[PDB]
Amino acid sequence: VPLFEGELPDQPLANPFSERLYKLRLQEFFLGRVPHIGDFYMPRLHSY
Amino acid sequence: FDGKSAKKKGPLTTWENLKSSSKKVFSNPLYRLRLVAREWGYPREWRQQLPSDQDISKPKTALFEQDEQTPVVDPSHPEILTPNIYTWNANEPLPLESNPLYNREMDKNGILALKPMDRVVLLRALTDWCASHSSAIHDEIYKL
Amino acid sequence: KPVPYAGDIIKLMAFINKFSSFFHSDLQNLSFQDFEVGLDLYPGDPNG
Amino acid sequence: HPRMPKPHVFHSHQLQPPQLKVLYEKERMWTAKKTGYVPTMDDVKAAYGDISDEEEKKQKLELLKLSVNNSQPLTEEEEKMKADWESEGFTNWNKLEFRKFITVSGKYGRNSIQAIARELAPGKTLEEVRAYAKAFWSNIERIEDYEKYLKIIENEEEKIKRVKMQQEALRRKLSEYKNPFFDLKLKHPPSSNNKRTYSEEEDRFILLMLFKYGLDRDDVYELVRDEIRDCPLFELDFYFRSRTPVELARRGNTLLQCLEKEFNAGIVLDDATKDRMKKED
């Protein structure tokens, strides 16, 4: 993680649930997108 | 007292707050809401939906333009800014008695005085105008 | 099961999640089932 | 001693000729001679022209010997021809009736006869308005402060027209693209100076929704909020909700302007040309 400073400030594989920019726009009980079918939703609780 | 108030810290409502002795805590907020609701907009299922399949929002209600002003007394400007105007087909809310908002019980009874689906509708609505008007959070989100 | 009323609940919950500071802790662990039973909703009907 | 060589009121003009004011001064003119009112640096004030000058001994004396020795002491023609000069005007349209008339005409357009008249009925009957409006343009020169009074007319209509070809402009595009909700392009004016919060296809919907209403220039911004309140895919955004139709104007107008600036070479392509009967175009 400390390597990615001059690079992206957050990892391509990072924690979404620490971003104040990706906070409002985020949907989380999404659980999966599947072609020709749709999307899979998992309301589980608060995480903020 | 927007956002910061006398009781600034914490969620605004507590168990004792609901279990308080006011016994009709829902009254004044319900009053305030039935005031602001008519102009704040309604969901379809709480709109007085058109029986008339002619005052669709897309057309208008009635022909306010009795006739087009073809014989302009000013031929120098044959253009007309009043070609054909109508009466307006805004969607209406229900009658107040047909407005479950106007069911007195919630003052004391609380949210459990309705049909379930209607309860759902009102909650979605309360979220709606809270996000649109709870100015504290409303600015906070845009800040964030 | 056809549940005409779920995604509404979903918005309820996600909103509540993003606004944790605004909400009671008892609100913070709420679930879908809480609302189902409490609000008296049963699945199955395409009509509610 | 002093008469009024400032004749009967004309600032609240009723579209009247100035020889009428000449004949109103003719009423002064006998009154000066009959009742012995000598023109004086007080009285001679429309023809004052004497600022510590010796025009006083002559210009005032000109009006003096003219008024006292009046060779038109309300000759019978003066009563008659003044009456026609005040008849040819429009007595009703005083500045009250005047200003409303001209303001409401400028509002709904220089030609919205019935529209402004349905409000102007207390002003007077419609054909009087038709007559009065007619001679109004012909005798706008007979109107004081008339150019600005015309500016409040023609400029007023322009913003109204501005939507008219914007009505036209959006007619184009929503008729132009094939699946604009998946085909549209406005990268000609991408953005002026913005935190560019609303992504395109969001806005494609809204403009689809705005124009499927069309450029109603009345209430659409109220209406689409309701759709955003109600759109199953668009209920999913919350930023779409904390934006009331008031702010939705800010965005909506902007994109109106965006398509406007995109089509600024294409709106006027079918906007501002009207032909007439006797010139090939």
UniProtKB/Swiss-Prot annotation, chain B:
Localization in the cell: Nucleus
Assembly notes: Component of the ISW1A complex, which at least consists of ISW1 and IOC3.
Other observations noted: Present with 1770 molecules/cell in log phase SD medium.
Function according to Swiss-Prot or TrEMBL: Functions as a component of the ISW1A complex, which acts in remodeling the chromatin by catalyzing an ATP-dependent alteration in the structure of nucleosomal DNA. The ISW1A complex represses gene expression at initiation through specific positioning of a promoter proximal dinucleosome.
UniProt-recorded name of the protein: ISWI one complex protein 3
The organism of origin for this protein: Saccharomyces cerevisiae (strain ATCC 204508 / S288c) (Baker's yeast)
Phylogenetic lineage: Eukaryota, Fungi, Dikarya, Ascomycota, Saccharomycotina
Protein's gene: IOC3
Full-sequence portion shown in this chain: 270 to 413 of 787
From Swiss-Prot, chain D:
This protein's encoding gene: ISW1
Phosphoserine carried by residues: S52
Role of this protein: Catalytic component of ISW1-type complexes, which act by remodeling the chromatin by catalyzing an ATP-dependent alteration in the structure of nucleosomal DNA. They are involved in coordinating transcriptional repression, activation and elongation phases. The ISW1A complex represses gene expression at initiation through specific positioning of a promoter proximal dinucleosome. The ISW1B complex acts within coding regions to control the amount of RNA polymerase II released into productive elongation and to coordinate elongation with termination and pre-mRNA processing.
Keyword Nucleus: yes
Single GO MF descriptor: ATP binding
SANT domain: residues covered: 88-141, 194-258
Annotated family: Belongs to the SNF2/RAD54 helicase family. ISWI subfamily.
Origin organism lineage: Eukaryota, Fungi, Dikarya, Ascomycota, Saccharomycotina
Transmembrane residue ranges: none
One cellular component (GO) term of this entry: chromatin
Name assigned to this protein: ISWI chromatin-remodeling complex ATPase ISW1
Subunit field text: Component of the ISW1A complex, which at least consists of ISW1 and IOC3. Component of the ISW1B complex, which at least consists of ISW1, IOC2 and IOC4.
Domain of life: Eukaryota
Keywords: ATP-binding, Chromatin regulator, DNA-binding, Helicase, Hydrolase, Nucleotide-binding, Nucleus, Phosphoprotein, Repeat, Repressor, Transcription, Transcription regulation
Localization per record: Nucleus
GO biological process: chromatin remodeling; DNA-templated transcription elongation; negative regulation of IRE1-mediated unfolded protein response; negative regulation of RNA export from nucleus; positive regulation of transcription by RNA polymerase II; regulation of chromatin organization; regulation of DNA-templated transcription; regulation of transcriptional start site selection at RNA polymerase II promoter
Note: Present with 1500 molecules/cell in log phase SD medium.
